[PDB]
Amino acid sequence: GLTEEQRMMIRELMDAQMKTFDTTFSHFKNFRLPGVWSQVRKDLCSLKVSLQLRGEDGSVWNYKPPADSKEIFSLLPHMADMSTYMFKGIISFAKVISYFRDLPIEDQISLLKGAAFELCQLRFNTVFNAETGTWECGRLSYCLEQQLLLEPMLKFHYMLKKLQLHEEEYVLMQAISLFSPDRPGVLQHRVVDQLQEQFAITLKSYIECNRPQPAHRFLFLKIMAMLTELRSINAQHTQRLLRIQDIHPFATPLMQELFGISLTERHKILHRLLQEGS
Amino acid sequence: GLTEEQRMMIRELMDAQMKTFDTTFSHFKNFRLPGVLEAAKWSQVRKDLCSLKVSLQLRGEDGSVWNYKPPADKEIFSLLPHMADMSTYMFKGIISFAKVISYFRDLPIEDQISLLKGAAFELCQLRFNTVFNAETGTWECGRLSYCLEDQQLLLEPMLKFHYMLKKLQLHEEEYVLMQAISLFSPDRPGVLQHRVVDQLQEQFAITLKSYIECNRPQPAHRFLFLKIMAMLTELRSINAQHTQRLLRIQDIHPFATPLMQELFGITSLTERHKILHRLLQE
Numbered sequence: 001g002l003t004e005e006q007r008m009m010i011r012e013l014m015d016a017q018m019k020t021f022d023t024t025f026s027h028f029k030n031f032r033l034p035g036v037w038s039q040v041r042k043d044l045c046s047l048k049v050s051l052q053l054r055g056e057d058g059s060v061w062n063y064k065p066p067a068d069s070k071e072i073f074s075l076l077p078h079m080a081d082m083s084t085y086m087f088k089g090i091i092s093f094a095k096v097i098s099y100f101r102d103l104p105i106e107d108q109i110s111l112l113k114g115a116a117f118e119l120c121q122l123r124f125n126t127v128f129n130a131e132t133g134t135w136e137c138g139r140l141s142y143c144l145e146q147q148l149l150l151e152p153m154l155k156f157h158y159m160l161k162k163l164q165l166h167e168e169e170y171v172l173m174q175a176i177s178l179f180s181p182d183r184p185g186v187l188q189h190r191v192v193d194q195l196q197e198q199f200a201i202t203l204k205s206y207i208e209c210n211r212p213q214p215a216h217r218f219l220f221l222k223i224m225a226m227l228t229e230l231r232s233i234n235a236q237h238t239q240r241l242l243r244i245q246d247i248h249p250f251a252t253p254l255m256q257e258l259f260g261i262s263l264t265e266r267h268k269i270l271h272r273l274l275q276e277g278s
Numbered sequence: 279g280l281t282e283e284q285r286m287m288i289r290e291l292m293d294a295q296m297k298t299f300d301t302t303f304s305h306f307k308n309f310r311l312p313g314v315l316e317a318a319k320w321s322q323v324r325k326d327l328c329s330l331k332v333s334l335q336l337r338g339e340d341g342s343v344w345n346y347k348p349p350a351d352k353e354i355f356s357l358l359p360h361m362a363d364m365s366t367y368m369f370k371g372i373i374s375f376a377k378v379i380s381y382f383r384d385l386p387i388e389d390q391i392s393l394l395k396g397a398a399f400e401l402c403q404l405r406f407n408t409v410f411n412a413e414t415g416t417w418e419c420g421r422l423s424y425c426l427e428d429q430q431l432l433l434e435p436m437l438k439f440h441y442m443l444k445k446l447q448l449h450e451e452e453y454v455l456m457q458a459i460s461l462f463s464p465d466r467p468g469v470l471q472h473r474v475v476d477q478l479q480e481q482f483a484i485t486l487k488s489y490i491e492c493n494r495p496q497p498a499h500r501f502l503f504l505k506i507m508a509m510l511t512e513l514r515s516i517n518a519q520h521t522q523r524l525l526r527i528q529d530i531h532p533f534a535t536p537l538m539q540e541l542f543g544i545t546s547l548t549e550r551h552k553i554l555h556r557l558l559q560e
């Protein structure tokens with residue numbers, strides 16, 4: 001049994017997730033596609049994937065990427081368009097949350113700047129297939145091509161998928177990650193921290209009310225440990241992606257705002273999206 | 279051996295084939311691709327498209343491979359715009375091939391149109407056979423490949439034609455001689471100079487027959503010429519079948535390029551074939 005606010009808190013996060021997560025990716029359209037230095041290449045080989053695109057008629061386009069030999073940056077324009085679409089649903093997810101919109105406009109930008117990558121990877125894990133190693137995104141599919149676990153990103157997705165979390169546990173991780181008080185640029189550190197502690201208490205209470213099996217022992221502490229690991233991966237890959245942008249500019253205008261390439265003035269797209277409605 | 283006129287007859291056909299056959303399909307660009315998105319009229323159309331089912335493969339300069347798996351069953355009309363662009367590109371190379379031949383230029387412009395109107399499909403299949411892989415079942419057109427999908431395929435005469443013709447393992451000179459015999463068919467609709475085209479076709483047949491006698495062993499290729507003539511006869515029937523299959527599909531779903539509309543009878547001999555007439559002047 002959870003308190004009435006804990007029940008209300010989960011139902012709002014669940015309602016916000018349903019309204020702002022295009023799990024079928026049907027509204028993802030107008031995306032770039034592949035046409036018909038030593039420190040950089042070591043990272044891209046781990047996340048090498050093949051792109052599949054199913055059609056409403058039943059046809060299947062399949063893209064096998066070129067081998068290792070300006071060929072490792074062919075999928076990045078598409079992945080930038082995909083990451084931007086995912087984050088636009090993340091922004092809408094934050095706007096629906098009542099505790100988020102009541103924050104100052106600068107804190108809303110600072111929180112989304114620090115949780116952009118983390119909240120996308122949590123939503124990506126829900127469409128990740130453990131056996132096939134494929135992120136099934138409705139019309140689109142991303143299939144990979146023992147040693148991969150050395151890459152923290154792939155290792156994070158396999159460990160998180162192994163926990164077999166509920167929808168409520170996924171959206172609570174998004175709330176705990178979004179309401180991080182120690183993000184760069186946050187002013188209301190104390191108010192955001194108070195909000196984060198309530199999401200953690202709600203997550204801890206939910207697990208005790210629905211997970212009696214021994215496979216889920218210490219599950220709350222595992223989740224909190226995964227959120228810390230995901231925070232480190234965020235710092236690694238955000239620093240890594242700036243090197244690729246430095247050599248081959250590929251980021252969309254919204255991704256450029258999130259990287260640093262007044263807050264409301266240099267984050268014009270993010271400011272406009274926070275003022276717009278559903 | 280071969281007579282000096284027959285030797286020069288092969289040299290001209292080989293020269294015409296070399297100048298007009300983009301064997302690597304390097305100049306085939308700007309083509310359409312399948313996008314990322316009464317009752318007896320359709321019933322007869324579905325039977326035609328399910329016969330030949332191929333998957334499209336696109337190799338890239340960097341090493342990437344785009345692959346298109348066709349759908350099942352207005353969904354079976356996804357590959358037609360691409361094949362219309364491929365056929366038109368092949369037709370233009372066939373027209374240029376005939377224009378290089380001196381025996382073809384001396385014919386009236388109407389007989390040139392009539393011969394090209396009846397042998398356009400046949401000469402493309404002969405060129406397509408040279409890039410067909412019997413083992414993999416794929417037409418390798420350089421960066422483009424067309425792999426078939428399921429004796430299940432021998433039922434269609436078109437696929438059976440390519441496998442039987444490939445088994446003969448014909449030379450380049452024998453292939454280009456088949457094109458001349460097929461191009462100079464005197465019994466095409468609209469042909470006027472029946473005797474010239476018939477005598478010209480007989481000389482190409484004699485040259486092809488004499489070429490086999492002088493460049494092949496004695497007992498092994500004793501009937502190779504008659505096998506070739508049988509394949510040309512079978513190929514003429516496939517042309518009549520395919521031409522009728524395309525008119526039914528075009529009537530329901532227009533996909534024909536302007537050049538294909540003229541060669542197939544869709545809307546004087548030069549009044550209804552203005553595009554084909556212009557390509558013969560230049």
Ligand SMILES: CCC[C@H](CC)Oc1ccc(C(C)(C)C)cc1NC(=O)c1nnn(-c2cc(OC)c(OC)cc2OC)c1C
Nearest residue numbers: 047049075079083084087116117124135142237238241258
């Ligand atoms: C389902 C597709 C995804 C998949 C899920 C983990 O994974 C990838 C797999 C392969 C590749 C290759 C290009 C190497 C082939 C990439 C990814 N993955 C990504 O391309 C990516 N995933 N997240 N982000 C990202 C997003 C952000 O917010 C918009 C952000 O903040 C601005 C920073 C980000 O990166 C540090 C990217 C660029």
